Amino acid sequence: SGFRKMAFPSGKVEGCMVQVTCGTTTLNGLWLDDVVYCPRHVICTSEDMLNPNYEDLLIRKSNHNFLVQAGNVQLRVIGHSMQNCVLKLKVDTANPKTPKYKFVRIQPGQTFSVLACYNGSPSGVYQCAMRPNFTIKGSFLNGSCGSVGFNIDYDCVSFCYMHHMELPTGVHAGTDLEGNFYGPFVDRQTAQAAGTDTTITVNVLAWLYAAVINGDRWFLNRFTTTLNDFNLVAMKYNYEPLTQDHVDILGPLSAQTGIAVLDMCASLKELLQNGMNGRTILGSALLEDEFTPFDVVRQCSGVTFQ
Amino acid sequence: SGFRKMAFPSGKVEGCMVQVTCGTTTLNGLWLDDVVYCPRHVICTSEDMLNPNYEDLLIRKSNHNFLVQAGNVQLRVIGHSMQNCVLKLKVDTANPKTPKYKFVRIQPGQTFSVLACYNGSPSGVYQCAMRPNFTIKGSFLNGSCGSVGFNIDYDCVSFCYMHHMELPTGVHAGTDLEGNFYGPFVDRQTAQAAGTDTTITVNVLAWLYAAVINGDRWFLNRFTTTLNDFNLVAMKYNYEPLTQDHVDILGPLSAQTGIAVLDMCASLKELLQNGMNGRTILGSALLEDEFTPFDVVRQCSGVTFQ
Ligand SMILES: [Zn+2]
Ligand SMILES: [Zn+2]
């Protein structure tokens, strides 16, 4: 028993991180097969970032202007191209440690593990969620750009995030591995507004089911409610509205605990209107929304990977 | 910027986990050089665990009674021995993926990463602290026994914990890699009492310094205090007393923020007597004690590993 904010094992990804250097800028890249992916602003100086013309900047660079260093070995750049906001550097050596991988564009509310890297070396790993406003609340210092987020399904690595920038508000923004930003952000150093950050209601509910499985049941009241009356209360507290798809995803958890989804919603409503009153749930005095329904079943059943 | 409960990259450890089977019981083992370490109760049945005579049970077992499986390959057991509460199985093949490693017995309040494994396959990784009562609050299901905790220093892996059992209270207990339990526990299925769990005060202080570095400064009052007057208040709330060694360890953080240790203590005292009043610090409504002073500097400077 017990419940922890758990990350995926990072072994398969550690063998794919490289150091990419262009001119003076150095950041991290992802080496899969014979191509290296990295943020395109590796070609910018501190002054270029205020208003960069990436096309014009990329024309001035040749294949030999890029230094790719795998741990302590240099890959030869024989081809470069720009796909949206990432650079694809084609090198001469295919990564012998390339795992089975896919590129995926996740949706808000989904979770993934981040391997924070500096100078192409892994520093730590943590689990987080894509917020409804397409930001993440991560931990990144200068030089962490190019760090990637990922999920693991059995033996396959699903890359879903590449880190690009910290906004003036302290939150973080990035792209999928095709270089398309999550959210309305651009790789430029300017004031950019993130929308209202809402709470991922389906994840809160999944967490409450985890609490029941692990012995915390004080929050279970004997009331019930309807989807409409619940969403009316949720919206007042900046909670994402609940749909039937969400109710369907929670089905396995409802069956294992004998607690109907709508009954759990009635419990959550009471917590929103009345608060926790100095109590905790799974050791927390706030409602957690960084566990999906799939995360809860994985941790409460013991799923493994290769 | 930002602050996350961060674990070490687990790559170096993933290549060391094996499946150990004796009779019907199967759990995880740690394969370093030509020896495999695992909990000795792998030789017990469900009925043996109530009152096991490990010496007498081990006599009935021969080298060929143990099945060691590395992923999908079998190591031949050519020697077995019992060191305290662990079994040392000497095999015929040295692990080609053996990293530089040490065995270390950590002290309460120190943190480490756990790689939770089932059937010798990694499931996830999380960071936790050894409580002052020598328990950990982990996430473990049946078959997770033999999972290890570890730290990383540059390129060397320090193994500090092997998981052995869940107490009837839901908390977890285990040994160092020499088989000596942390705490007064024994590998027997009986009611065992853990002492009072106290809050690791030096870690709370380090966390408060992390908050200041990251922009949360509302809790900074303009009072001060003495070590004696502070410890008098701490003890009333089940907080570990502060010593001069603790003040010395916090020195680098005091210098970087310009806030004297004793001034921070005065701020913490106020939080203990008055509470948070519905506010948060680094996104938390409780005081966190699972970050050491060393963890804070590592995450606020960008330390890396190989
Ligand atoms: Zn950058
Ligand atoms: Zn066991």
3-state secondary structure of B244: helix
Q: At A48, which amino acid appears?
A: D
CA B97, B99, B104, B110 dihedral sign is: negative
Nearest to A107 by CA among A6, A200, A42: A200
Other C-beta atoms lying within 10 Å of the C-beta of residue B245: 9
Contact by Cβ (8 Å): B292, B298? no
A166–B1 CB contact, under 8 Å? yes
Q: HSE of A9 in the Cβ direction (CA atoms, 13 Å)?
A: 26
Shortest distance, CA A298 to any CA of chain B (angstroms): 9
Residues B220 and A252: their CA atoms lie apart, in Å, by: 46
Q: Give the H or E element holding residue B152.
A: strand B148-153
In angstroms, rounded to a whole number, what is the distance separating the alpha carbons of residues A298 and B302? 31
Q: Is B205 strand, coil or helix?
A: helix
Handedness of CA A173, A175, A179, A185 (dihedral sign): negative
- Tell me the C-alpha distance between A138 and B282, whole Å: 12
Which residue(s) pair with B26 in the sheet? B21
SS (H, E, C) chain A: CCCCCCECCCHHHHCCEEEEEECCEEEEEEEECCEEEEEHHHHCCCCHHHCCCHHHHHHCCCHHHEEEEECCEEECEEEEEEECCEEEEEECCCCCCCCCEEECCCCCCCEEEEEEEECCEEEEEEEEECCCCCCECCCCCCCCCCCEEEEEECCEEEEEEEEEEECCCCCEEEECCCCCECCCCCCCCCCCCCCCCCECHHHHHHHHHHHHHHCCCCCCCCCCCCHHHHHHHHHHCCECCCCHHHHHHCHHHHHHHCCCHHHHHHHHHHHHHHCCCCCCECCECCCCCCCCHHHHHHHCCCCCCC
The answer to whether the CB atoms of B11 and A6 lie below 8 A apart is no
- Is the sign of the CA dihedral B226, B231, B236, B238 positive or negative? positive
Closest among B84, B66, B69 to B25, alpha carbons compared: B66
Residues in chain B, total: 306
Residues with Cβ within 8 Å of A119's Cβ and at least 6 positions away in sequence, in order, are: A19, A26, A28, A143, B304
Of A59, A74, A57, A60, the closest CA to residue A21 belongs to A74
Helix (H, G, I), strand (E, B) or coil at B159: strand
Of B86, B106, B102, residue with least CA distance to B36: B86
For the beta carbon of residue B294, count every other beta carbon within 10 angstroms: 15
Sign of CA pseudo-dihedral A185, A186, A187, A190 = negative
Main-chain phi, psi angles of A68, to 5 degrees: -105, 120
CB-CB under 8 Å, A122 with B305: yes
In A, which residues are within 8 Å of B121 by CB distance?
Answer: 304-306
Residues B117/B156, Cβ–Cβ less than 8 Å: no
3-state secondary structure of B22: strand
B8-27 residues touching A, CB cutoff 8 A: 8-11, 14-15
Q: CA dist B254 to A12, B109, B208, Å?
A: 39, 20, 11
Nearest CA in chain A to B304: A123
How many Cβ pairs within 8 Å bridge chains A and B?
150
Query: Cα(B159)–Cα(B152) distance, rounded to whole angstroms?
Result: 9
| 3-state helix vs strand vs coil in chain B, percent to 5 | 25, 30, 45
Q: Is B169 on the interface with A (CB under 8 A)?
A: no
Tell me which residues of chain B, numbers 53 to 92, contact chain A at a CB-CB cutoff of 8 Å.
71
Q: How far apart are CA A12 and CA A105, in angstroms?
A: 20
Cα separation, A197 vs B125, whole angstroms:
28
Write the single-letter amino acid at B292: T
Q: How far apart are CA B149 and CA A179, in angstroms?
A: 37
Kindly state the tokens that stand for B251: 């020195």
Residue in the block written with tokens 């990329």: A58
Strand order in the sheet with B17-22: B73-75, B66-70, B17-22, B25-32, B35-39, B86-91, B77-83
Residue of A nearest to B140 (CA): A1
Report residue B47 as tokens. 């009925």
| Phi-psi category of residue B92: left, alpha or beta, with phi > 0 → left and psi -120 to 50 → alpha | alpha
- Give residues with Cβ within 8 angstroms of A249, minimum separation 6: A202, A293
Write the DSSP symbol of residue B179.
S
- Class for domain A11-91, per CATH? mainly beta
The Cα–Cα gap between A61 and A55 comes to 10
Largest Cα–Cα separation, chain B: 69
Tokens of B88: 């040392």
The DSSP output letter for B181 is: B
Candidate from A4, A116, A119 with C-beta closest to B126: A4
Q: Which residues of B173-212 are buried (b: 16+ CB within 10 A; e: fewer)?
A: bbbbbebebbbebebebeeeebeeebbbbbbbbbbbbbbb
In angstroms, the first-to-last Cα distance of chain A is 23
Do B148 and B30 touch, CB atoms closer than 8 A? yes
Helices (H), B142-195: none
CA nearest to A29, candidates A115, A154, A139, A110 = A115
Residues B90 and B35: beta-carbon distance below 8 Å: yes
| Per-residue tokens: B236 | 């009333």
Q: Under a CB-based contact definition with an 8 Å cutoff, are residues B52 and B41 in contact?
A: yes
* Nearest Cα to Cα of residue B296 among B258, B249, B248: B249
Q: Is A242 on the interface with B (CB under 8 A)?
A: no
Check A303 against B123: CB less than 8 A apart.
Answer: yes
Nearest 10 degrees: Cα torsion B297, B299, B303, B304: 150
Distance A59 CA to ligand 1 centre (A): 20
A124/B8 CB distance under 8 A: yes
User: A201-300 falls under which CATH superfamily?
Assistant: main proteinase (3clpro) structure, domain 3 (1.10.1840.10)
Using CA atoms, how far apart are residues B145 and B27, in angstroms rounded to an integer?
Answer: 6
Question: In this structure, are residues B214 and B3 in contact, taking their beta carbons and an 8 Å threshold?
Answer: yes
Are A93 and A75 contacting, i.e. CB atoms less than 8 angstroms apart?
Answer: yes
User: CA triplet B78, B82, B83: central angle to 5 degrees?
Assistant: 125
Q: Which helix (H) or strand (E) is B255 found in, with range?
A: helix B251-257
Q: Enumerate the residues of chain B whose CB falls inside 8 A of the CB of residue A71.
A: 306
A254 to chain B, any CB pair closer than 8 A? The answer is: no
In the Cβ-directed half-sphere of B271, how many Cα atoms lie within 13 Å? 25
Closest CA to B232 of B219, B241, B244, B221: B241
A72 neighbourhood in chain B, CB within 8 Å: none
Residue B7: partners with Cβ closer than 8 Å, 6 or more residues away: A7, A124, A125, A126, B113, B125, B126, B127
Q: Where do we find the tokens 């662990």?
A: B86
Query: Are the CB atoms for A115 and A10 separated by under 8 Å?
Result: yes
| Interchain proximity B125–A125, CB inside 8 Å | yes
State the smallest CA–CA distance between residue B89 and chain A in angstroms: 24
Reported resolution in A? Answer: 1.9
- For chain A, what is the largest distance between any 2 Cα atoms, rounded to a whole number of angstroms? 69
Task: Tell me how close the Cα of A64 comes to any Cα of chain B, in angstroms.
Answer: 27
Structure-token pair, residue A178: 């095709």
Cα A294 from Cα A3, distance rounded (Å)? 14
Query: Which residues sit opposite A19 in a β-bridge?
Result: A28, A69
Instruction: Mark yes or no for CB contact B71/A306 under 8 Å.
Output: yes
> CA triplet A124, A127, A133: central angle to 5 degrees?
120
Q: Dihedral, CA atoms, B182, B185, B188, B193, nearest 10 degrees?
A: -140
Q: Give the residue from B105, B83, B282, B263 showing the smallest Cα distance to B176.
A: B105
Same fold, B11-91 and B201-300: no
Calculate the CA dihedral of residues A212, A216, A219, A222 and round it to 10 degrees: 60
The closest alpha carbon to B286, from A191, A279, A136, A66, belongs to A279
